[PDB]
């Protein structure tokens, strides 16, 4: 009997609120749009991870040289990490 009374009271108290649904709907929409953003811009910029880079940093008074070529060791590793991350982001967007 007490459980019946509490259930009826909770139903009357909660059927009238209508906030949790709005919050979860907003969270779902935000997750979708953020996934879209981070799958668009990241894939747009993903080609910018290159192992060798040419920099003409314009310093002669201290060096005597103009242009330089550099090897960045982590470019392959970072490209692989970005690929795995964007694949996981694709999965996240599918779920969203």
């Amino acid at each position: 009997k007490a459980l019946f009374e509490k259930v009826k009271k909770f139903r009357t108290h909660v059927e009238e609120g209508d906030i949790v649904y709005r919050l979860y709907m907003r969270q779902t929409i935000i997750k979708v749009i953020k996934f879209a953003l981070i799958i668009c811009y990241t894939v747009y910029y993903v080609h910018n991870i290159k192992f060798d880079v040419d920099c003409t940093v314009d310093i002669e008074s201290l060096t005597g040289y103009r242009t330089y070529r550099c090897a960045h060791p982590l470019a392959t590793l970072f490209k692989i990490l970005a690929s795995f991350y964007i694949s996981l982001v694709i999965f996240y967007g599918l779920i969203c």
Binding site: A2, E5, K6, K9, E60, S61, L62, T63, G64, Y65, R66
Partner: protein, 116 residues
């Protein structure tokens, strides 16, 4: 890993870098330890202490913010009243008589009446 790499300027005009067959490396006739010493001294003097102690000021401000947040919980006089209030309120929220009184806006146990 915080440090600076310093290189002298050959052309000094009023204490300013004047900036005045293939390319060759300009040699400053200075060994490595001299670079270490000059880097240390320049980092010591000409680097703004704000850029050097930024994380420490941030940490101090976070610590005082947290202390102010929890001070009333930590201060015994206020904490005693707070624990008294929260202890009483929980049982007032869960009293077996509260539900029936709210329902009436019956048969009751004498124990629950005594406790109420």
């Amino acid at each position: 890993q915080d440090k600076m790499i310093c290189l002298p300027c050959k052309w000094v005009t009023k204490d300013s870098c004047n900036d005045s067959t293939g390319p060759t490396g300009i040699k400053y006739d200075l060994d490595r330890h001299q670079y270490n010493y000059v880097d240390a001294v320049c980092y010591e003097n000409r680097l703004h202490w704000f850029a050097k102690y930024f994380p420490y000021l941030v940490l101090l401000h976070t610590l005082i913010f947290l202390a102010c947040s929890n001070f009333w919980f930590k201060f015994p006089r206020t904490s005693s009243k707070l624990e008294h209030f929260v202890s009483i309120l929980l049982k007032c929220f869960d009293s077996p008589w509260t539900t029936r009184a709210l329902s009436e806006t019956g048969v009751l146990d004498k124990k629950e009446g005594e406790q109420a």
